Every structure is written in structure tokens, then in C-alpha cells.
Amino acid sequence: LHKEPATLIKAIDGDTVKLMYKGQPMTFRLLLVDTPEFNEKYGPEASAFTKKMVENAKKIEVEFDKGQRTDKYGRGLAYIYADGKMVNEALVRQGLAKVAYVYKGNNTHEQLLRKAEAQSKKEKLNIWS
Numbered sequence: 508l509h510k511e512p513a514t515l516i517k518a519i520d521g522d523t524v525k526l527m528y529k530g531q532p533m534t535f536r537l538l539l540v541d542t543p544e545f546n547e548k549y550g551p552e553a554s555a556f557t558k559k560m561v562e563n564a565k566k567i568e569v570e571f572d573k574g575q576r577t578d579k580y581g582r583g584l585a586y587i588y589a590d591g592k593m594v595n596e597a598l599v600r601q602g603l604a605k606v607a608y609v610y611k612g613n614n615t616h617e618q619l620l621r622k623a624e625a626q627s628k629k630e631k632l633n634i635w636s
């Protein structure tokens with residue numbers, strides 16, 4: 508897998524963000540995670556978390572997996588990095604997302620995120636409190 512450049516257009520919620528990718532605006536859905544919706548418990552904190560992560564980053568990168576690169580809603584499916592740190596993994600580590608929507612062939616970082624979820628649960632963070 509490899510990292511490609513992108514720039515923030517707009518923070519949306521915990522697991523979606525608007526980025527410019529090869530010069531085109533695009534909504535990205537974070538692979539392998541599920542944040543609560545804004546109106547749900549920890550939704551606002553998930554949105555705040557992702558928003559600050561991507562807004563403070565001097566360098567956003569997108570990393571496609573080996574499978575489907577856009578979902579049925581036209582959203583990009585990727586791992587998103589903010590100054591080399593994976594937003595997907597950071598949300599799970601902080602208990603602001605659950606490992607989820609694990610589909611065969613788009614699951615390269617599954618065990619890395621499950622390891623983060625195990626530590627978050629151990630610490631009873633946020634969703635696991």
C-alpha cells in the first residue's frame with residue numbers, strides 16, 4: 508500500500524472528511540471504523556477529534572487498500588494520515604470509533620486497528636467507559 512497527497516477541503520464528522528485528491532473534491536469514508544453519528548453518544552467528540560486532527564495537520568495523505576476505492580455512495584474509501592499518523596487508528600485507540608465494516612480485500616490494517624481497540628477497551632476509553 509502507499510500514501511498519496513491530498514488537502515483538507517472540510518471536516519465533516521468522525522469518520523468522513525472532504526479532501527481534494529488529484530485536484531478533485533471528494534468525500535472520504537475512513538476504512539475499517541465506525542464513529543457514532545453526530546446526534547449519538549460520543550458523536551460530537553468523534554467529530555471534534557477527527558476535525559482537529561485533520562485541521563492541525565500540515566500534511567494529509569490518503570492510502571487506498573487493495574480493493575474497492577469508492578463505496579456505493581461515491582465516497583472514497585481510504586486510510587487517512589495527518590502528519591504521518593493514521594486518523595482511523597487514532598479514533599479507535601481513543602475509543603471514539605469501533606473497528607467495523609471489515610470487508611475481505613480492503614482489510615490490510617485490520618489487526619493494527621483491532622490491537623488499538625483492545626488497548627482502548629482495556630483503558631475503558633469513551634465508548635468503552
Ligand SMILES: Cc1cn([C@H]2C[C@H](OP(=O)(O)O)[C@@H](COP(=O)(O)O)O2)c(=O)[nH]c1=O
Nearest residue numbers: 536537538539540541578579584608610613
Ligand atoms: C466503511 C464502509 C462503508 N460502506 C458502506 C456500507 C454501509 O451501507 P448502508 O448505508 O447501506 O448502511 C455504509 C456505512 O457508512 P456510514 O457508517 O458512514 O453510514 O457505507 C462500504 O460500502 N464500504 C466500507 O468500507
Ligand SMILES: [Ca+2]
Nearest residue numbers: 541542543544
Ligand atoms: Ca458512522
